[PDB]
Design a protein around this ligand. Structure first.
Ligand SMILES: *CCC(=O)Nc1ccc(CN2C(=O)N(c3cc(OC)cc(OC)c3)Cc3cnc(Nc4ccc(N5CCN(C)CC5)cc4)nc32)cc1
Length: 273
């Protein structure tokens, strides 16, 4: 791999808006596993005193394509801007050392595992669940306003902080069960296909980390969706929230709610409870 094998130093351009001093960073233990590169917990000073963050870097066997992908993800996160319910870029280290991309840490892991660990034989009351759904819709509303189509919205892609704040990951760049029909069949992706995926995520939330379309092989999902198959109401789900899911899975993208409406609708349920 030319660039990584050939250069003693990697002369990425200095962006002063984002560059973070390496000596104010303390690298710690690895985070998750290793399918999306190498990510570690770290402490960052003066983001005065410390705070916990997550740091992505190249695995020691990275290819030039891994380098390009890390850089591109970095660049995309710079343009998207900050919001409470997404994993935010906090800084980069590009000058005179290894490439480090510093983002927000979410101590409790992804939403699917958070929910499943806390299943009852309470903790996952109706208000907690609606709050999860609400927070994710707010993040998606933000992303949509920044013209960012996620394309892989799922509970495994939503991370949970120490304070139970939902944060969407992988906004900057088997998934088939989260894909809208127009994306499944015609590889078309729009904000309204993210809304479909959000419907699946909603079902995920109210089955407390359940797996979508249980018992069904991915190969048959094509025709099943074509024949108009839809998942049924989760036991932990009032008919009015199920109505929301079903609307998100409208065959016609224009007849699905927008994220603005999902936020307003879920906000209402929260005030009531
Ligand atoms: C192949 C499956 C797999 O390994 N998935 C996976 C890998 C790594 C992470 C960790 N991340 C993460 O990648 N973050 C991130 C980086 C980044 O780079 C620019 C961009 C992002 O979105 C745009 C996100 C962020 C992040 C924030 N917090 C956490 N916290 C975390 C805490 C605990 C855990 N656990 C996982 C599993 N188990 C059993 C216990 C605890 C994971 C993550 N992580 C990341 C996530 C998934």
């Amino acid at each position: 791999d030319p660039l990584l094998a050939g250069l003693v130093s990697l002369d990425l351009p200095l962006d002063p808006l984002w560059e973070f001093p390496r000596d104010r960073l303390v690298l710690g233990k690895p985070l998750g596993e290793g399918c999306f590169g190498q990510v570690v917990r770290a402490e960052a000073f003066g983001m005065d005193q410390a705070s916990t963050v997550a740091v992505k870097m190249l695995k020691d066997n990275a290819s030039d394509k891994d380098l390009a992908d890390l850089v591109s993800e970095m660049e995309v996160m710079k343009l998207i801007g900050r919001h409470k319910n997404i994993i935010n870029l906090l800084g980069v280290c590009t000058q005179e050392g290894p490439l480090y991309v510093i983002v927000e840490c979410a101590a409790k892991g992804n939403l699917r595992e958070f929910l499943r660990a806390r299943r009852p034989p309470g903790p996952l009351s109706f208000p907690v669940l609606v709050s999860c759904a609400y927070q994710v819709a707010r993040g998606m509303q933000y992303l949509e306003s920044r013209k960012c189509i996620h394309r892989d919205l799922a509970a495994r892609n939503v991370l949970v902080t120490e304070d139970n704040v939902m944060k969407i990951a992988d906004f900057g760049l088997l998934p088939v069960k989260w894909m809208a029909p127009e994306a499944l069949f015609d590889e078309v992706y729009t904000h309204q296909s993210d809304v479909w995926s959000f419907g699946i995520l909603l079902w995920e939330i109210f089955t407390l980390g359940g797996s979508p379309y249980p018992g069904i092989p991915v190969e048959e999902l094509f025709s099943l969706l074509r024949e108009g198959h839809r998942m049924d109401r989760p036991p932990h789900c009032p008919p009015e929230l199920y109505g929301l899911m079903r609307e998100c899975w409208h065959a016609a993208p224009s007849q699905r709610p927008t994220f603005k409406q999902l936020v307003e609708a879920l906000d209402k349920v929260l005030l009531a409870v």
